[PDB]
Amino acid sequence: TTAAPLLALLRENQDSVKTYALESINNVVDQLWSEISNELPDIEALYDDDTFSDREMAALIASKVYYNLGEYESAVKYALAAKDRFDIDEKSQFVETIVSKSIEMYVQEASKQYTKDEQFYTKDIIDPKLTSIFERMIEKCLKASELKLALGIALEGYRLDIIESALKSKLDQSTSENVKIINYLLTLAITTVTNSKFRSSILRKSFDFLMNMPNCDYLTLNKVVVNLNDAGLALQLFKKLKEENDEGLSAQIAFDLVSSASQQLLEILVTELTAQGYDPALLNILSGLPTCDYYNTFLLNNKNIDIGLLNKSKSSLDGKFSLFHTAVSVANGFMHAGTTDNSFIKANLPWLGKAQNWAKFTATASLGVIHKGNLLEGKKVMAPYLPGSRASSRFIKGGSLYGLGLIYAGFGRDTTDYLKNIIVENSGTSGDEDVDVLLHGASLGIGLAAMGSANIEVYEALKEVLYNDSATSGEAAALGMGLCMLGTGKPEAIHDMFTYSQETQHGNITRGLAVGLALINYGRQELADDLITKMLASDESLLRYGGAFTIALAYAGTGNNSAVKRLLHVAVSDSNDDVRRAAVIALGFVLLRDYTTVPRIVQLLSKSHNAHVRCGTAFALGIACAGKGLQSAIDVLDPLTKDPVDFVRQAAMIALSMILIQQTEKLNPQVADINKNFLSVITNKHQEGLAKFGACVAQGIMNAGGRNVTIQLENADTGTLDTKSVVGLVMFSQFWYWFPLAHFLSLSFTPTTVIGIRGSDQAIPKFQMNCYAKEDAFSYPRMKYSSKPYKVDNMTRILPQQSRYISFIKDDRFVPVRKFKGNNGVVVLRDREPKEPVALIETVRQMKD
Amino acid sequence: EQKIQETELKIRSKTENVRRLEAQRNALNDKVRFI
Amino acid sequence: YFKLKKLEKEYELLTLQEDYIKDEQRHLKRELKRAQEEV
């Protein structure tokens, strides 16, 4: 029984007697181990003895000693030494810890050797003592019908054999089981797998299971194509639509891919798809024609500007230079965005004449936000100010070429050849200041039209503008080249534009180059660290400004603790208020995924002696919390509203305007205090100048698009980071430093509508749902789950957040599929009985085509 | 499922370490409001 | 399955606040230098 004398008798002869001696020891291994541990070195010495054949049973004894000694690493070695006595299926606290310890050490070596070889799990690169328990644990979880621990550990183990082989045996094909399995693999691996190559294969292997399209989830396969940006998988989706013929399923795939894909993937869906055959109904869909048509028509049906509250805002004073006129013009241009209403410019004469020279840019560019989405008459709005028709002056003429950039952005291939010809004419030299103004709006318009597509002609045309060292259009040339270099970009253009920033020192140039060097690196993560190190080591104020946005864009989406430590040390050690403001704003772009921890960090930075630090955290809080929940961020911005600093209250009103969209009517109790401050701060002369100027746009953002459009960034509809939405918010960070850039914000405003259309072509009918919904669209600025139906759930405005409780009635000619898919841009639900009257109403969308 | 629970217990232990930040932040705000 | 996802999400707060309390001490040292100038 007592193992103390037996362990000392193992140095004698007759090894057959030692077999019987070890039998009585296995009882006290969990009892006397604190005593017999003095004889433990004799147990380990016999394992290496070639004449000792009892190591099979001797390994079990030593496995329970070192473990209870407090060494978890040793318990794995002695347990797998024999590879026989160890039983993983036995349920005890001794085995479960050894299994969890072997997996923990296996993840550390899996994240390293994966770079050299991806086949390491099939090879000897890893010592089998790590993979022995790791393989037996997965097989034990598969027999227990538990996919939480099996799939969760597989993502940490970085092994492709587990997910690929086990999924084939677990196939239940309802057919909704395989959809949730990938959803558990997609959601967890993003915050777990640190290597973009491993998660690239997980989405690729899952494509071969659903490739047959047995009424499976297309949104799951769409997120695979968008994340991988593969041209072969995008074309393969339409290859299966030719075999299985469905008008409803093939449509929803086409509307979804055109919005989330970049300019490079749209060429495969149009040019490459035409060569291999296509659907005549789906060709125009992938070209973006219906996408812009839905945004313009849905806003025109229900439109409330409420000019009564706006008249009192813009009639206060004619002075304060353009800062008052710019505030009311940029704000009003948001309310009519997409509805094509010129009443501010046309119906009101005096507010246009009171503007200054450079102030006429906002009055002209306001129509670009208003008429955004018009691919036909968008040029006729700027027709009198186009080149060759001259203009009232050359300061206002430059805004016309920029107005075409906001409307046609991404569709501006026709204007791409038109806008670059004006740059070549002015590329020689400039004799006047307003000449660069015409080049300023031209370079920004072609940058938006070519945004997302790499063009060597636009890069070389704007490169000659940088050589001229223009104090006005110098930033426009840098921003135009950065939008073409979005994504991986050109590595040669990284060091070239960085060299011109050190050679040419200018405020409007280098600052634009610093932002341009941030746009060229998008989603590169550690690949952009070479440029980040050069900016952090330099003491230049403008180079440190672009260093934060370079970290913001590359490290966005999935959060990274390495990018947090960089932005935190810069906002503290550096004494520059503009750089501290850029570091706290750059933190919000990395936190876009998790909006719950964003206010907690802002509360820590809400108390500071610097105004720019509190001003940066104000707008950075509203970036991630715009279209998300957690209404408590309003109370965080309350003390910033009382800040005597002028520009802090300006960014505070804008941040409040982003979170409070559609929060009225007994949703957020703070909507009463924000609506009073609209007319109170403007009319009162005791407040700050920039405070009332920001309250104008603050009232204009909540009323933008006629109370309809909302700011959607990193949602379930897109599936990834929106390129147009993240760039527009960066431009807002520069307001009074040079000239308001707020016109770029129009890319983030999208309406909220739910409509089925048809299964073939454009319809926009009129029907009713009557499902549980909050009261929003019928609550406009004036002069508990009860399962109770709402007035009309079709179209209107409402809210995307609380619309998850809205169902779809099946009593009409349509049928529900996703049970409120909840996608406002894609829409186009399934029609089970086409060619039947829907009570269709033809919209004005023909004018936008 | 015990591997996740035992690991989560460390977060609750480090939660009391976050309490040390409130003592330093309030002492820092007293110096900020003073200057 | 939320216990696995929310597990690694809480370390982001422990990562920032670990070096953030150290920045308050560096700021406190700067306030002491400003306090000597006030005298």
Side-chain angles (χ1 to χ4, degrees), chain A residues 643-840:
Chain A
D643 187 5
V645 179
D646 56 352
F647 59 86
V648 175
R649 294 184 181 177
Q650 185 174 356
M653 294 299 293
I654 303 301
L656 293 173
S657 63
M658 294 176 71
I659 298 170
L660 294 173
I661 294 170
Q662 295 299 322
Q663 294 301 322
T664 59
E665 185 66 14
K666 294 176 179 177
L667 271 65
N668 190 338
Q670 294 300 321
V671 298
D673 290 344
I674 190 66
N675 291 336
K676 183 178 179 180
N677 290 336
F678 294 159
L679 296 175
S680 178
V681 177
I682 295 171
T683 58
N684 190 341
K685 294 177 179 177
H686 295 82
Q687 295 299 321
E688 295 82 358
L690 296 175
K692 62 180 67 180
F693 296 158
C696 296
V697 178
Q699 186 174 355
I701 293 171
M702 293 177 70
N703 290 336
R707 181 60 176 165
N708 190 341
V709 297
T710 60
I711 295 170
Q712 294 300 321
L713 179 62
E714 184 66 15
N715 61 344
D717 291 343
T718 299
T720 187
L721 177 63
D722 187 5
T723 300
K724 294 177 179 177
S725 296
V726 64
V727 176
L729 296 175
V730 175
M731 297 297 103
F732 178 80
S733 63
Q734 186 174 355
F735 178 83
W736 57 273
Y737 296 92
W738 184 80
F739 180 82
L741 295 175
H743 294 83
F744 295 98
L745 295 174
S746 63
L747 296 174
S748 63
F749 295 98
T750 59
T752 59
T753 57
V754 176
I755 186 168
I757 310 300
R758 289 176 297 180
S760 178
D761 290 343
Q762 294 174 333
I764 302 171
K766 183 178 179 180
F767 59 89
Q768 293 178 336
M769 293 178 182
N770 291 336
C771 296
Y772 176 79
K774 302 299 183 181
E775 294 178 351
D776 289 342
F778 294 96
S779 178
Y780 62 91
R782 294 181 182 175
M783 295 300 294
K784 294 177 179 177
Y785 176 76
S786 296
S787 296
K788 294 177 179 177
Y790 181 77
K791 184 177 179 180
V792 175
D793 288 342
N794 190 30
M795 294 177 70
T796 61
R797 293 193 295 272
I798 60 172
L799 177 66
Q801 296 177 337
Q802 294 300 321
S803 61
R804 62 180 296 176
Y805 296 140
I806 296 171
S807 178
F808 178 80
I809 183 169
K810 62 182 178 181
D811 290 344
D812 58 352
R813 297 295 181 190
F814 298 95
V815 61
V817 175
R818 298 294 181 190
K819 294 177 179 177
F820 179 76
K821 182 179 179 180
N823 192 338
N824 299 131
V826 171
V827 292
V828 183
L829 295 175
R830 185 182 296 275
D831 187 4
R832 65 182 181 89
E833 293 178 351
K835 294 177 179 177
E836 295 301 321
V838 296
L840 188 148

Side-chain angles (χ1 to χ4, degrees), chain A residues 304-314 332 335-336 341 343 783:
Chain A
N304 290 336
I305 295 99
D306 187 6
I307 61 172
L309 297 176
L310 178 63
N311 290 336
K312 294 177 179 177
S313 296
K314 61 190 182 70
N332 194 342
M335 295 177 182
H336 300 293
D341 188 4
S343 296
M783 295 300 294

Side-chain angles (χ1 to χ4, degrees), chain A residues 184 187-188 191-192 561 564-565 568 572-573 580 597 601 604 609, chain C residues 1 4-5 8-9 12-13 15-17 19-20 23 27 30 34:
Chain A
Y184 296 142
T187 300
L188 295 175
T191 59
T192 299
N561 290 336
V564 174
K565 294 177 179 177
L568 178 63
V572 175
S573 178
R580 292 182 181 175
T597 59
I601 297 170
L604 296 175
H609 60 284
Chain C
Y1 63 91
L4 178 63
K5 182 179 179 180
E8 294 177 350
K9 292 165 62 181
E12 294 178 350
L13 295 175
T15 300
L16 187 147
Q17 293 176 335
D19 290 344
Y20 176 77
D23 290 344
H27 183 198
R30 294 182 181 175
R34 294 182 182 175

Side-chain angles (χ1 to χ4, degrees), chain A residues 637-645 649 688:
Chain A
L637 297 174
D638 289 344
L640 296 176
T641 301
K642 294 176 179 177
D643 187 5
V645 179
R649 294 184 181 177
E688 295 82 358

Side-chain angles (χ1 to χ4, degrees), chain A residues 342 367 371 374-386 389 400 403-404 407-408 415 418 846-847:
Chain A
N342 61 345
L367 296 175
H371 294 82
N374 189 340
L375 296 175
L376 177 63
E377 294 178 351
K379 294 177 179 178
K380 294 177 179 177
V381 177
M382 300 297 180
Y385 295 94
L386 293 176
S389 63
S400 63
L404 297 176
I407 299 170
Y408 294 92
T415 60
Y418 176 78
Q846 294 178 336
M847 293 177 70

